[PDB]
Amino acid sequence: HMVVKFSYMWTINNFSFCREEMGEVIKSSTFSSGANDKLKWCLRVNPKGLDEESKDYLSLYLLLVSCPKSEVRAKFKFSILNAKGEETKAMESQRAYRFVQGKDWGFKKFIRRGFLLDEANGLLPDDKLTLFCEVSVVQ
């Protein structure tokens, strides 16, 4: 089946200053395809994981904030833009997932904190975490 494909670049400034504890969430602004499909999406990150078993990781999800019909099927890909402006450390759905309004899908163990937070690895230029999300909605 064909798709409508779109993207959002989320810059989280002053990332080293995040005070989020395990289970606390930051949501992005809402975004859409611009195809007037009435779908609104956002990203959400847990800097210290969804739960105790994931507290060593950032957990990253795509949330369907509002939709007109009962269900949407969509593939998704998340990557980090490094200091050289290139995509790295990407994770992508192996198939389309079924979203309804208020449902998310993503990666509970998206990136290990001990790796991300070491500035020498080039993922927090200017103390900014920049995430790039591509969404493909199945038509």
Binding site: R44, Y61, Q94, Y97, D104, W105, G106, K108
Partner: peptide, 8 residues
């Protein structure tokens, strides 16, 4: 390889 999941 990681698999996708939902927070709910």
């Amino acid at each position: 390889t990681p698999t996708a999941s939902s927070s709910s």
